[PDB]
């Protein structure tokens, strides 16, 4: 019931083409609203609300804080990348591919391709009947984060009675299950 | 474009609770627990490749505490406005009869990062066997959290995820059954 007050620093590194281009943000949030940020592509601190002004003004006046901030892109981001790269950037987990029929209230009325426990997120799930791709007549849950470094999705085809084809970085050739 | 690592922290008053975590593309690498003063890797196997000294993050949070109290006063004590969470419950994988699984309570799109959570089986609170993540960040700067309950699927049990938050007038009671 008491009033609450919240303070989020966010220190982000954005990696492009591997490590060839890096963008570092130092971002500060009072309650929900951002107030002040350092942006590697800008080169100094900027206020984004009037609250963050004295912070931005004062940090800008310090040669060493500014020198440190400008270094982060190399001395922190590129550092950290090389440390975690092995088990994050190069992480690869095979999906498990189930197909079962389902209902939505009637045999019954749609087929479900279930693809679970994969990493990374990027995936291509597609339906086939007799070699032909069924482009229209299918719905999805989208991509779902499980929170444990695996994704899952359900791609459903609505036709009353088939091949599910799953392409993914983890496998050298697409996974099929037939029904 | 392709990869993003964020050092994400907060401090909250008057609860006096802070967090510190690293995030990779929306997944926790690790966090440090203030209470136990130890660094916890999201996957056991991470810790074999990298180190982080917890006492660094503890030092960072002290400053965060200090700084929050400046901004509260600077703002003439304007409180955060509660955004109520959005709860949904799904299974780790396709549900087979009496084949081991995990229920996931997915708590999304909320602020501030305080949440009371209870699993119920058949209306009876489940204390032991539970597991949870810390508060994960979002690009819109709300929070996100996962609760987990491993289980044997059966006709016998119904399950619920009871979530309390200050934005909610009513405790949110999300149902799952076989």
């Amino acid at each position, epitope marked *: 019931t008491r009033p609450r007050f919240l303070w989020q620093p966010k220190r982000e590194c954005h990696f492009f083409n591997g490590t060839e281009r890096v963008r570092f943000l130092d971002r500060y949030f009072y309650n929900q609203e951002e107030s002040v940020r350092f942006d590697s592509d800008v080169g100094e601190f900027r206020a984004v609300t009037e609250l963050g002004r004295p912070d931005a003004e004062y940090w800008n006046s310090q040669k060493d804080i500014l020198e440190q901030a400008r*270094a982060a892109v190399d*001395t922190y981001c590129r550092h950290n990348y090389g440390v975690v790269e092995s088990f994050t950037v190069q992480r690869r987990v095979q999906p498990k591919v189930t197909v079962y029929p389902s209902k939505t209230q009637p045999h019954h009325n749609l087929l479900v391709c279930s693809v679970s426990g994969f990493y990374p997120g990027s995936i291509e799930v597609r339906w086939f009947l007799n070699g032909q791709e069924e482009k229209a007549g299918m719905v999805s849950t989208g991509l779902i984060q499980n929170g444990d470094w695996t994704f899952q999705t359900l791609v459903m085809l609505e036709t009353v009675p088939y091949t599910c084809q799953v392409e993914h970085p983890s496998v050298t050739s697409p996974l099929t299950v037939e029904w | 474009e392709e990869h993003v690592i964020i050092q994400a922290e907060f401090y909250l008053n008057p609860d006096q609770s802070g967090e510190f975590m690293f995030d990779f593309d929306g997944d926790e690498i690790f966090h440090v627990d203030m209470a136990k003063k130890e660094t916890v890797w999201r996957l056991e196997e991470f810790g074999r490749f990298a180190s982080f000294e917890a006492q*660094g993050a503890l030092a960072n949070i002290a400053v965060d505490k200090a700084n929050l109290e400046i901004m509260t006063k600077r703002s003439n004590y304007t409180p955060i406005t509660n955004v109520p969470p959005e709860v949904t419950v799904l299974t780790n994988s396709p549900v087979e009869l009496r084949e081991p699984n995990v229920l996931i309570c997915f708590i999304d799109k909320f602020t501030p990062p305080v949440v009371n959570v209870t699993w119920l089986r058949n209306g009876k609170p489940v204390t032991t066997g539970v597991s949870e993540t810390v508060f994960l960040p979002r690009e819109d700067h709300l929070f996100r959290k996962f609760h987990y309950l491993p289980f044997l699927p059966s006709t016998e049990d119904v399950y619920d995820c009871r979530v309390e938050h200050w934005g909610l007038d009513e405790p949110l009671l999300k149902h799952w059954e076989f």
Partner: T-cell receptor, first 105, second 121 residues
Framework: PQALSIQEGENATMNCSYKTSINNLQWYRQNSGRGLVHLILIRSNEREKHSGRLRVTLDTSKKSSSLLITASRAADTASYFC????????????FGTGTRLKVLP | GGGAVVSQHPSWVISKSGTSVKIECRSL??????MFWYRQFPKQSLMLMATSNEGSKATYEQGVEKDKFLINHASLTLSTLTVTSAHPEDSSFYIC??????????????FGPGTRLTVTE
């Protein structure tokens, strides 16, 4: 280890190579027995840095730094070392091979 | 905080060959999770020898006689290098440094005055 460099009141330029990719590089001077005075630090993104009579080059291409001390006093006589932490590694600083400097009046 | 000095004691040592020698490295203004022991002989440069860490293990650089010394770091302010046996060949300059744990990315460390040990038969 230890290269020797001798002069008068002129400019002194001293070189210091290192074995790994880097984050921070710090220059030190040492007298005899004890000593260890921190002089300056240049970071793996910066090329040039000026402080007092001292000036530091860094060329991460050739993994090499240069220390230029400009109006050399007698009391500049010392060993000059530079120490570096390796990027994506531990906290450790490792010491490069050094130069002994003698400034004669 | 906002500052850092480290103290190394004792400054000079004379021990008989066969006796243990104990050196203390203290951070006074700041806190160290991790400290570093360097050895140096008359002409040559500073060899890093061990890293000490609060709980527990000592690492030891390659290399480097591993456990002809013991390192104890269980203080967050104090790391102890004890040379177990000590012979004339160990007569050296020893010097410790400590990383401020507040520094993070800009990896800030500070050196003690040193210890000037000589062992005689």
């Amino acid at each position: 280890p230890q290269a020797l460099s001798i002069q008068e009141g002129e400019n002194a330029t001293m070189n210091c190579s290192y074995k790994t990719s880097i984050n921070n590089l710090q220059w030190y001077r040492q007298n005899s027995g004890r000593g260890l005075v921190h002089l300056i630090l240049i970071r793996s993104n910066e090329r040039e840095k000026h402080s007092g009579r001292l000036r530091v080059t860094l060329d991460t291409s050739k993994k090499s730094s240069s220390l230029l001390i400009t109006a050399s006093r007698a009391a500049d006589t010392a060993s000059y070392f530079c120490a570096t932490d390796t990027t994506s590694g531990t906290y450790k600083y490792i010491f490069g091979t050094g130069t002994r400097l003698k400034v004669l009046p | 905080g906002g500052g850092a000095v480290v103290s190394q004691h004792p400054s000079w040592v004379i021990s008989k060959s066969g006796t243990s020698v104990k050196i203390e490295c203290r951070s006074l203004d700041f806190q160290a999770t991790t400290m570093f022991w360097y050895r140096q002989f008359p002409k040559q440069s500073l060899m890093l020898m061990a890293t000490s860490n609060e709980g527990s293990k000592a690492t030891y650089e390659q290399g480097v006689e591993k456990d002809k010394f013991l390192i104890n770091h269980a203080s967050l302010t104090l790391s102890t290098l004890t040379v177990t046996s000590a012979h004339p060949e160990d007569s050296s300059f020893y010097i410790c440094s400590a990383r401020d744990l507040t520094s993070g990315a800009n990896n800030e460390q500070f050196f003690g005055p040193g210890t000037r040990l000589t062992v005689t038969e």
